[PDB]
Amino acid sequence: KGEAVIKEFMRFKVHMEGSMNGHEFEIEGEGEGRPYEGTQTAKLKVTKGGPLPFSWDILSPQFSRAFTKHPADIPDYHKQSFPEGFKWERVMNFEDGGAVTVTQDTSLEDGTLIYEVKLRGTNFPPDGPVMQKKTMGLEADTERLYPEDGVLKGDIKMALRLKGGGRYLAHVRTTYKAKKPVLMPGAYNVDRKLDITSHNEDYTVVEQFERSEGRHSTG
């Protein structure tokens, strides 16, 4: 059924189980958006291990690949994968040695997208900006994707804003795997900006917004 199945308005539910420097936690949330316009929002709640003793900015990019706008000539790998869906596998590596491995499953149940996330973060300095909660959101960035063996492989130069000024950098590498063969794009870029739009004081309830749009590279 493919893109037919992804409607101009879609809802999702998400659950994450994670650990950061051995601190176990869980998140549950729900979201919605306009998949063809590249916009979405989510409301997340900490359901275990709260209040989190680390930056929310580690978690925010783990909460939705059906919601990227494409120009007419770039086929949408993720939208085509439905109703079966897809998985992804990510490594984030930060300038001070922090490391995060993340896996995700995306399915569709009764017209709602279902996301299950598993996260493990290690090697964060206990007095660094992530474990001291001294970051201030993700800067806009670009994911360079290329096709290989029926999967997409992405690379991001990510930047977290520091409280008081400056940037805290990471590289993000992800493989995106449809559960059935789909029409492959060529190599292309996805430009993203993800904002935390509201939160309670202890970040046990958080809302975020993301705009995502695919484009060709010029070289």
Author numbering: 4 to 66, 71 to 226
Could you pull the original sentences from the published paper?
To explain the high pH stability of the LSSmScarlet2 protein and to elucidate the effects of mutations introduced into LSSmScarlet during its directed molecular evolution, we determined the crystal structure of LSSmScarlet2 using X-ray diffraction at 1.41 Å resolution. We observed the LSSmScarlet2 protein as a monomer in the crystal at pH 6.0 according to estimation by the PISA server in a fluorescent state. LSSmScarlet2 has a canonical β-barrel overall structure with the DsRed-like chromophore, which consists of 69MYG71 amino acids and is located in the middle of the central α−helix inside the β-barrel. The MYG-chromophore in LSSmScarlet2 makes five direct hydrogen bonds (H-bonds) to residues R71, W94, R96, D147, and E216 and additional H-bonds through the water molecules to residues T112, E145, and L200. The phenolic hydroxyl group of the chromophore makes two H-bonds with the side chain of the D147 residue and with one internal water molecule. The negative charge of the pair D147/phenolic hydroxyl group of the chromophore is balanced by the positively charged R198 residue, which is close to the phenolic group of the chromophore and forms a solvent water-mediated H-bond with D147. Similar to LSSmScarlet, we attributed the large Stokes’ shift found in LSSmScarlet2 to ESPT from the phenolic hydroxyl group of the chromophore to the –COOH side chain group of the D147 residue. There were six mutations in LSSmScarlet2 compared to LSSmScarlet: I74T, D170G, D177H, Q189L, Y215F, and G226D. I74T substitution results in the formation of a hydrogen bond with the S218 residue. Hence, the I74T mutation was the only one responsible for the improved pH stability of the LSSmScarlet2 protein, and among all LSSRFPs tested, the LSSmScarlet2/G170D mutant and LSSmScarlet2 demonstrated the highest pH stability in the entire pH range.
